[PDB]
Amino acid sequence: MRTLGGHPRRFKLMGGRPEFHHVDRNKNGHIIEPTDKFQVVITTSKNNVHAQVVNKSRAYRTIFGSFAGNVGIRKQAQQGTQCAYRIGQNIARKCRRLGISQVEIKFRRIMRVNQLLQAFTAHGLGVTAIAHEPRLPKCG
Amino acid sequence: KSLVKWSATKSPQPHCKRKRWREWSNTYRPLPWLHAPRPEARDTRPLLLAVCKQLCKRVHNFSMKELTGMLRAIAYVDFREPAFFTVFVNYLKERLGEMQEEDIANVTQAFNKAKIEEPHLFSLMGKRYQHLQANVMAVKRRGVLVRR
Amino acid sequence: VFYETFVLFSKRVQRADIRQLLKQQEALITKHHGSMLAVRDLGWRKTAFRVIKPRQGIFWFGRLFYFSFGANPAAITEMSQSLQSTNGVLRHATVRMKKRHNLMTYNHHIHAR
Amino acid sequence: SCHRHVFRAAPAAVFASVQRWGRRNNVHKLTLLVQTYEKPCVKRTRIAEEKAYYPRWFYLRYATEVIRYSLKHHLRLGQA
RNA sequence: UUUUUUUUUUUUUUUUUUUUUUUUU
RNA sequence: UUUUUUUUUUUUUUUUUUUUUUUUUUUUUUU
RNA sequence: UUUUUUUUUUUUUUU
RNA sequence: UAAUACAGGGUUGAACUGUGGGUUAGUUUCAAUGCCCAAGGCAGAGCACUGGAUUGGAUACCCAGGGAACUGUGCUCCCAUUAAUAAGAAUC
RNA sequence: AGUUCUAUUGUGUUAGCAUGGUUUCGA
Lengths: 140, 148, 113, 80
What we know:
This is part of a larger assembly, with chains A, B, C and D.
Chain A lengths: L7 H5 L26 E5 L6 E6 L5 E6 L14 H18 L5 E4 L6 H7 L8 E4 L8
Parallel strand pairs in A: 1-4, 4-5
Antiparallel strand pairs in A: 1-2, 2-3
Helix pairs in contact in A: 2-3
Chain B lengths: L1 H5 L2 E3 L13 E3 L19 H11 L6 H11 L7 H4 L2 H6 L7 H13 L5 H14 L3 E4 L3 E5 L1
Antiparallel strand pairs in B: 1-2, 3-4
Chain C lengths: L1 E7 L6 H17 L3 E19 L3 E14 L4 H11 L5 E6 L17
Antiparallel strand pairs in C: 1-3, 1-4, 2-3
Chain A binds five RNA strands through helix 1, strand 2, strand 3 and helix 2.
């Protein structure tokens, strides 16, 4: 009982600090500037799926990310279609908190890339361009 | 706009981590003839405060492209007057839609240089800049590929 | 028989080095009963992608050179290995001289009509 | 690698174009083959079988086009 | 040493030391 | 475990020839 | 927590 | 399987030659994989082997570890034995 | 059928090079 959609390990370390406290800042002390570009790199797999945010205005520096274990989904429930959909919602909801509107989308595979795209358009996170760079082997 | 350029020299100071590494920087020549008074002349006010006083009195006559340049230049002579920059916060919020892409880049530099951290205005400016940049595609090691 | 070689220099290559390089090469030619044909230059060339050569750095462009010669067929291996050891030279190739297709007798009316 | 820009188009419409791009280059087929090790003997027979089925599909695809084209126009050819 | 993202009164301007180490706003 | 970057070592069939178009030119009675 | 399975375990990381 | 060196085969043009041939031991080269021996190593894989599953009563199926085997001028042809199940001439 | 000459070369052998899946490193 008492289920929570988060990471139990991180919840135990809570001490009342606000959000975005451990993230490093810049010289000016601003977490993010109005002039910036983002490109989320999504990687799919059989059981789990990861999607981290990469900032192109900071020499490709990561800001935050999420996984199946950060939404309260474990065991075989991750293989279900809801696991991908829930992860996308968290990214879209968290995007509005930082103050970003337009974020690019990048992925290597096309297997679990349908639930994430649909969830982004249901909150406000739009899509400006789609990038696909499959690193297919060039040798036997 | 041109005064700041004259009083600026590009140098390559040593890096913070590795002293062998170099990073290009900017150094501005100090001015010792703009802050002092002029008791001899009738106008006892200095040359710097006089420009600011007239600018705020006739802000409406200036266009958007003509406003960010003048504000960006005042902060480049070490003008630590947060009250001066706090008058334009209400004027800019009501005219955010009429702001060009160049205007965004010419206004953030001013507040940051003077150590004026404003979250209610910087949060709104982020959306405007991204919306304008919604029609330009740029890739890595190739540049801008598709524009509009 | 006749042979051709295309050498791509770097930005870090002065005129001093180019003269030295060519002089060294001529030694081998003469050794094997040969003679130089002609030396020409092609100027600078833009590179499609960045070149990452170890212990050399990263470059985006270079100076393309061309020189024709003739010697024994066994001299190709000696020449090829010498270029690789020398600095400045990031990429090179040796192409045999053909009868019709060549950079000597056939250099006009390529792109036009 | 493929890159597309969204301009006055819905995300769903744009996403339908990149999906078909992989089929031409067989991106999906090559991705799965490398994941698992396939014996050389199996590839010997699989490579030959694909050279007889695919050609037949092209001929049948053209036949279906004539049926749809003629259905909307009626008429019929004969030994005239 | 390597350069990442932009504009057009100019060859101009910001950033800079490896990231990420939490849901509902 | 994900992302990013800048030069160590082993290995070398992904792309590139084709509607099987000679009198169709060839495979074995019957069920 | 990660990986893996129809499902699960072993194994690995420790502010 | 881009470049270069050595030497073969196939298609077409000229010259020369003027029946040179088919099959082939008491013969001679090459010949996948496995095994003996030898050389070896610092990648990607895995037989044997106590390393986490079985059953409606027995198991190698599904993960992970794992010191044999994987480049040879050699010893050497057991097989589902390498481009159909005839090496040649005549009738299109 | 065979020899010589000429055009043609993803057929045998071949040490350095370029690119790439995996792997490896973190002033």
